[PDB]
Design a protein around this ligand. Structure first.
Ligand SMILES: *C(=N)C1(NC(=O)[C@@H]2C[C@@H](S(=O)(=O)c3ccccc3Cl)CN2C(=O)C2(c3ccc(F)cc3)CC2)CC1
Length: 217
């Protein structure tokens, strides 16, 4: 694979969003990945509706503002035959009745791919596909209060993940210096404009390769 990848530089990635006081991280991870794959396919970047996922993907197993899985979101989009745009179905950070309207659908998917649970495989996938949904262990004050540089938490778990985010690339600092470029959903005042550089090739730090996946389109 290349030594560095950054899909943001190719137009694959919407600006950093903010989930607010709703446990919808999984919905932002899933819209991020689908935004990327729709861009790959069509050349058009259109921001997608997390609220549509929050309100409507219960049947697939998601739990609204209480949590969910990116693969269940990808399944919803396939089952449903569409997903509305962010503009048409804006984000409210609370649960409400499903208001999906097929007239405003701007995305589709045909399923999803679960990546092997190794960082080499995750790198392969990022290098070829685009941005990738990942699970991480973000349950640490060091993460909540992260500002700069490559994030490494000695007490991170590779099994107990609690937050869905989006890998948009990877690289290295200087010339234990590799990182994953990770888009969060906590607004642009957290981290590096809303991004974190997660330690890469340090034995699956924080579980970043433990539940990685993307939608097929
Ligand atoms: C986001 N605001 C919150 N976190 C979750 O909803 C996370 C997202 C996924 S994950 O990325 O952690 C994960 C973990 C293991 C395997 C696959 C994935 Cl995609 C699930 N989340 C959770 O916190 C858990 C969960 C699992 C199943 C479920 F139905 C609801 C939650 C505990 C793993 C809401 C804080």
């Amino acid at each position: 694979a290349p030594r560095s990848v950054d899909w943001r530089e190719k137009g694959y990635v919407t600006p950093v969003k903010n989930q607010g006081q709703c446990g919808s991280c999984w919905a932002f991870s899933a819209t991020g990945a689908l935004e990327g794959q729709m861009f790959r396919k069509t050349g058009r970047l259109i921001s997608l509706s997390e609220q549509n996922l929050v309100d409507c993907s219960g049947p697939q197993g998601n739990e609204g503002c209480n949590g969910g899985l990116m693969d269940y979101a990808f399944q919803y989009v396939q089952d449903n035959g569409g997903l509305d745009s962010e503009e048409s179905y804006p984000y409210e950070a609370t649960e409400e009745s499903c208001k999906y309207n097929p007239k405003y659908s701007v995305a589709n998917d045909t399923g999803f791919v679960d990546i092997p649970k190794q960082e080499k495989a995750l790198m392969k996938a990022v290098a070829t596909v685009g941005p990738i949904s990942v699970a991480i262990d973000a349950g640490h004050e060091s993460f909540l209060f992260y500002k700069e540089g490559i994030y490494f938490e000695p007490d991170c778990s590779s099994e107990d993940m609690d937050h869905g985010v989006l890998v948009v690339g990877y690289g290295f600092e200087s010339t234990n210096n590799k990182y994953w470029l990770v888009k969060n959903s906590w607004g642009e005042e957290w981290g590096m404009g809303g991004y974190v550089k997660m330690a890469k090739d340090r034995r699956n730090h924080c579980g970043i390769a433990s539940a990685a996946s993307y939608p097929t389109v």
